[PDB]
């Protein structure tokens, strides 16, 4: 038997209509108990099993999977989530870490990439699966993606030792700090543009063990709740004025992700470049990411943004760059130079270095 904790934080998967719009919906365990694919009553009764704990039917091979449902209060639309909410989730996993073999987190899709990236950094030396999932349609609506998404998450966390924060949707498992939301309506809502999926589900389960990170049983779980809140993301657009960038980078901002064009380029008008220098001199750290979905920041043009306090983000997603920026800036007693060196290193599989 393997025991999982299922953390319900909110999002479309549980949602209910109310006033003609979707809002977060309570009473998940009550529903799941009535669904044979989520709960084997026969096995639970013949094991006089705790009434708070559910049991999946047997799968083909492997151990049996049991799980407990922790429903947070209040439940949130993921659009309203912030760094504090993701810290609370990390703390729930810390508190219950020893009692369970894996974790599944039900989450809204709107900011799921940000949440997976954050938790990836907060949960240092993680040894157990933390699988995020969600749905474009609520589980109470008849025709939905939620049933198969939730079941798959539980089976993956239940049956495999993948020690990463991942995202499971639409029969695929992605590295959490590598995903981005690409479609607002289709069930194939997420994409891992610069890395293969960690796993694919069909008849067979195919896992890329060559990519999955190795369990460091030696080192204990450290949960970083000291994340810098004053970080931002700024998308460059053609002709963005120096005066607007000056205003955006004012104190108390400590770090910013600049989303630049193509292979990492921006306008070279000197007054704009001057505001970036000025901000560097005040101590701001800047990471350069590409607005493009696929590919890497690379020098090579007269317009490439490099220099004073500007670290290349290589092929990182913006969601990951931002979370990493928050992590590194929150570490205590480091120099500006040391902080940039950490930003330029692959800390959780979020970044591919060249040769």
């Amino acid at each position: 038997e393997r025991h999982l904790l299922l953390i319900y934080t909110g999002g479309t998967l549980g949602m209910q209509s109310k006033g003609g719009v979707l809002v977060p919906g309570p009473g998940l365990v009550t529903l799941l108990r009535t669904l044979p694919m989520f709960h084997d009553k026969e096995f639970a009764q013949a094991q006089g099993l705790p009434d708070h704990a559910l049991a999946l039917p047997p799968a083909s091979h492997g151990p049996r999977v049991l799980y407990t449902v922790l429903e947070c209060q209040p439940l949130l639309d993921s659009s309203d989530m912030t760094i504090d909410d993701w810290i609370r989730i990390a703390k729930i996993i810390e508190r219950h870490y020893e009692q369970y073999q894996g974790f599944v987190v039900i989450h809204g899709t709107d900011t799921m990439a940000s949440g997976a990236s954050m938790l990836s950094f907060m949960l240092e030396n993680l040894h157990k699966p933390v699988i995020l999932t969600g749905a474009q349609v609520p589980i109470r609506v008849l025709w939905n993606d939620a049933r198969e998404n939730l079941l798959g998450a539980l089976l993956v966390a239940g049956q495999y030792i993948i020690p990463e924060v991942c995202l499971f949707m639409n029969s695929q498992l992605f590295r959490g700090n590598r995903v981005t939301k690409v479609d607002s309506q289709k069930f194939e809502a997420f994409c891992s543009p610069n890395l293969s999926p960690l796993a694919t589900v069909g008849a067979d389960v195919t896992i890329a063990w060559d990519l999955v990170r190795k369990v460091k049983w030696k080192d204990p779980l450290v949960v970083h709740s000291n994340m810098e809140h004053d970080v931002a993301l700024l998308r460059l657009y053609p002709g963005i004025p120096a005066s607007l960038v000056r205003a955006f980078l004012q104190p108390p901002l400590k770090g910013v992700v600049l989303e630049t064009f193509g292979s990492g380029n921006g306008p070279s008008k000197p007054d704009l470049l001057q505001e970036l220098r000025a901000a560097a001199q005040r101590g701001l750290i800047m990471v350069n990411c590409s607005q493009c979905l696929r590919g890497s920041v690379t020098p090579g043009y007269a317009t490439s943004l490099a220099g004073a306090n500007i670290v290349s983000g290589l092929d990182m997603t913006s969601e990951a760059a931002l979370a990493k920026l928050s992590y590194v800036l929150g570490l205590p007693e480091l120099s500006l130079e040391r902080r940039q060196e950490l930003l330029a290193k692959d800390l959780r599989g979020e970044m591919t270095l060249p040769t």
Copy 2:
């Protein structure tokens, strides 16, 4: 014979190494003249043809294609382009509109989507093709995507009556105000996420005539050079503070595209919503676009951004929303309400209504 104007504005296609980096490179016509696929010397000599004008070899069917090369000065990395640069390009097309049957614009890829979207709006009632193109590798490097991209542009503009600003790359023709750059290295650099390509090239040329806009031969070309410069784009990120949004939306800003999550949602914390209202009261117009590559802004959540001065962008790209915002706000003597009505309408094929 069909005569085309080839406008070389800059970008990687012509570029040259200098100080170990790529910068814009002059002398295009000189090079093209030496390439048989771009210039038929035999036909030019046997027609004693102007020395500034080149001639493509005969294609399978259709008329012969001639073209003149106008090389702008200075040449630009597209990362440095602004609304004024795109206006200059529209003006070149206006000045020479009667003399040519089509236009091809060589452009850097970094801001090509912004440029195609801008020209789409500036060139009202366009009757002739205006085809943008570029390359991830310069034409002077041996292994490149530039040869085939440029030739395809010239043949499309030269042989078909597609009255739109388009982008031709990697054997596909896209509606210009529908594209976005998705790959910084691969030759398949562009994508039209919410609309099919207008055309595909292989053995056959396949054109989606069901999508191509109709020539309005009744109405003359109007070229809008009064585009509002004070428009911006703002990407929401989780926990973005009200104080930072306040600072961003200060005067003199007149319009902004808010890039929101998923189907058009943002944080509902009241102090943030309050700063959007405040800015609406100052007369700011806001368009809501999705950060997602594919799909549409739709109401349906308690977190959906709608209301005071906020127009839904449906499935518009951000590049297109931003250009449309610039166009509509530049029109003289319209009420705020009329401006929002135009923003909610499909003006150049950039937007699908439900």
Copy 3:
């Protein structure tokens, strides 16, 4: 309320292990009854509803959906199916046509394209949906594609007036005579290479009404059980000998689909071409389809197969060409010439003319 007939013919969806391999599995209605997503016990009891008939829970909009399960005997692995089996299925639909508003046919995937194509031709002037479906993993196994495939079929047939034989798999609805099986393991097992899906299911249901065929309420259902059995498929391979083709095309064969290379080409060695002429003189009809997944048979080479009794299959799938050949040859009292004209015309949406 809309009432559907669910015809269970066999295939993996229902299957059971036995002797270490998968074989067809009885007792479908018994299982479905126990699944809340397939049967609303509360509504059935509060309507004292027939015990043989199930009821789907309410969907968002639309009418309620009820359905009856007809489990054929014996059940078949689709690899064993033939024209007679598909005729039987058409006859079941004919016998019960008036009593139901739609049909769903559970079928093995191995020959599902052949079956959908056949039924498409057999069911002339169809007014109601006939949706085929199946699964790579049985519905009794916990992790499967069968639950969502079957439910989607029932909801599509139950809620929409799509008067075609279709295939529903993996959240997509395809025109049946346009599909082919491309993957032996993945859940995305099927592809419609030369036509868009008729519909896609996500948050919204998107239907291509521009493609869906029109209901001919005036004309009654005619069910062709006169399908020619003596038709075959022959795949050319490099250096295939004339003597082997002679043997293949001997009487009593009446029609053959030649699967040729690329854009419709074969070897031009004269003894091979001579055997095709000889067979034409005996009255054999030949349809030329491409071995390629995507694209169209087109003349243009010295190696193109055209002439005596050879009709181009354009962009038809082989499964569709073969079924159409069976249909046309089964029609009574037509001249060879008229038969070839029908083969060259789009009769059920299986073929795009240039």
Copy 4:
């Protein structure tokens, strides 16, 4: 300097209109000479270089590339090619192996996959690139894919040590015995359904060295010209009759590829199974391949074709199965059982043994 042999066998790339249809076209070297991208006159003259030999302009990095054009006679539409034509090509490569560092073979697309597969088997212990290429549109037509396809082949063979028979089309390099033609009109005409491309070309060249086979410098090139001619391919279709299968498998046929449904199934009607057994008793060897594009043949159904003289083709393409059948059957002095063991083994990277 690296010197290549360019073997022009025929196909659409060189073709000419004549009587309103495309036929093979002579005079390739004459044309290429006039194209600056294929011939640097300045460098050739300043090196007083042989008049039969051309020279590519300099590429970014790497050595300079020179090449000689050998134009076969007669030139062929690939639809008319046979085993004897592919043997002649292997013999050309054998004769000239020591003089050149690589080979490019221009070939019609209609049977290119069969040709690449054949050469793969014929050229044992190959150490140098043999790159096949072709085009959907002739090089003399203005708007074509031929220029870039031919140039890329020459640059790949000229600049990298990939010791395989490959196919280069539309900016991708595929393992030759893994490809199949999937589109009769689009420039993306080929697909490698069960294996990644060996390489991709863009700004950067990306090579999957993890997949490319290793140079066996110890072992010399052996070229097999004893290939069995009496092999065939038979596609099963629903209700195919026993009497027709009997006629197809008559002597002198020695081997056949059965293209079956899905994961490797056919009809189980006993009279059909009886004809397969009869043919096995006459000494016929049978390989089972899937009609599916992205198929592996796997047992698991009552309809799976396995037994007397029937070898599973796993994920092999039919073109590869058919060539392999011709190779193995042509080897001298082997027992029927030994022949089947070779058919079941990955000999040139054409087959993945499963997980």
